[PDB]
Amino acid sequence: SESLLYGYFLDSWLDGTASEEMMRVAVNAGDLTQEEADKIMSYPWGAWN
Amino acid sequence: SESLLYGYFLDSWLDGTASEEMMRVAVNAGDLTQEEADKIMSYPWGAWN
Amino acid sequence: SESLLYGYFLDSWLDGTASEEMMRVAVNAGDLTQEEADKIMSYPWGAWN
Amino acid sequence: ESLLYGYFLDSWLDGTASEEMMRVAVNAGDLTQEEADKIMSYPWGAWN
Amino acid sequence: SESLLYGYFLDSWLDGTASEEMMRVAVNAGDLTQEEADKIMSYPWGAWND
Amino acid sequence: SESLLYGYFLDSWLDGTASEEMMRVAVNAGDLTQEEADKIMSYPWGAWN
For an interface test with A, give the residue of C3, C8, C33, C43 to mutate (most A CBs within 10 A).
C43
As a whole number of angstroms, the distance between CA A22 and CA A40 comes to 12
For an interface test with E, give the residue of F3, F32, F43, F45 to mutate (most E CBs within 10 A).
F43
DSSP string, chain D: --TTHHHHHHHHHTT---HHHHHHHHHHTSS-HHHHHHHHTSPTTTT-
Please, is E35 exposed, middle or buried when counting C-beta atoms within 10 Å of its C-beta (0-12, 13-18, 19+)?
A: exposed
How many C-beta atoms surround the C-beta of residue F31 within 10 A?
Answer: 25
Calculate the alpha carbon distances from C28 to B21, E41, E46 in Å.
47, 12, 18
As a whole number of angstroms, the distance between CA B29 and CA A38 comes to 9
As a whole number of angstroms, the distance between CA D42 and CA D45 comes to 9
Minimal CA separation from E50 to chain C, in Å: 8
CA F13 to chain centre: 6
Query: In 3D, which of D27, D17, D24, D29 has the Cα closest to residue D40?
Result: D17
How many C-beta atoms surround the C-beta of residue F46 within 10 A?
Answer: 12
D15: left (phi over 0), alpha (psi -120 to 50) or beta: left
Minimal CA separation from B32 to chain D, in Å: 15
| Long-range pairs, F30-33, Cβ under 8 A, ≥24 | F30/D38, F31/D9, F31/D38, F31/F3, F31/F4, F31/F5, F32/F3, F32/F5, F32/F6, F33/F3
Query: In 3D, which of B20, C20, C39 has the Cα closest to residue A4?
Result: C39
As a whole number of angstroms, the distance between CA E15 and CA B20 comes to 39
Cβ atoms of residues A3 and A36 within 8 Å: yes
As a whole number of angstroms, the distance between CA F23 and CA A22 comes to 44
What is the gyration radius of the CA atoms in chain F, in angstroms?
Answer: 10
Minimal CA separation from F30 to chain D, in Å: 9
Alpha helices in chain E (DSSP H): 6-14, 20-29, 34-41
Whether the CA torsion A3, A7, A9, A13 is positive or negative: it is: positive
| Long-range pairs, E44-48, Cβ under 8 A, ≥24 | E44/C25, E44/E14, E45/E13, E45/E14, E45/E16, E45/E19, E46/E14, E46/E15, E46/E16, E47/C22, E47/E14, E48/C12, E48/C17, E48/E11, E48/E14, E48/E15, E48/E16
As a whole number of angstroms, the distance between CA A14 and CA A40 comes to 9
Strands, E assignment, chain F: none
The data reach a resolution, in angstroms, of: 2.0
Report CA dihedral (D16, E12, C26, A26) to the nearest 10 degrees: 20
As a whole number of angstroms, the distance between CA F26 and CA F20 comes to 10
Q: Taking CA A30 as the corner, what is the angle to CA A24 and CA A36, rounded to the nearest 5 degrees?
A: 60
As a whole number of angstroms, the distance between CA A12 and CA A3 comes to 15
For an interface test with C, give the residue of A3, A15, A17, A49 to mutate (most C CBs within 10 A).
A17
CA D21 to chain centre: 8
Spatial neighbors of B14 by CB under 8 A, at least 6 apart, are B43, B44, B45, B46, B47, B48
Do the chains contact at F22 and D5, CB–CB below 8 Å? no
| Eight-state DSSP code of residue B44 | P
Do the chains contact at B17 and A48, CB–CB below 8 Å? yes
| Domains of chain F (ranges, CATH numbers) | 1-49 (1.10.10.1530)
Calculate the alpha carbon distances from D20 to D14, D27, D34, F25, F27 in Å.
16, 11, 15, 22, 25
Experimental method: X-ray
Neighbours of chain B (3+ CB pairs under 8 A): A, D
Whether the CA torsion C35, C36, C39, C42 is positive or negative: it is: negative
At position A36, the amino acid (one-letter code) is E
As a whole number of angstroms, the distance between CA E12 and CA D26 comes to 36
Three-state secondary-structure class, residue A1: coil
Cβ atoms of residues E22 and E9 within 8 Å: yes
| Eight-state DSSP code of residue E40 | H
DSSP string, C1-49: ---TTHHHHHHHHHTT---HHHHHHHHHHTSS-HHHHHHHHHSPTTTT-
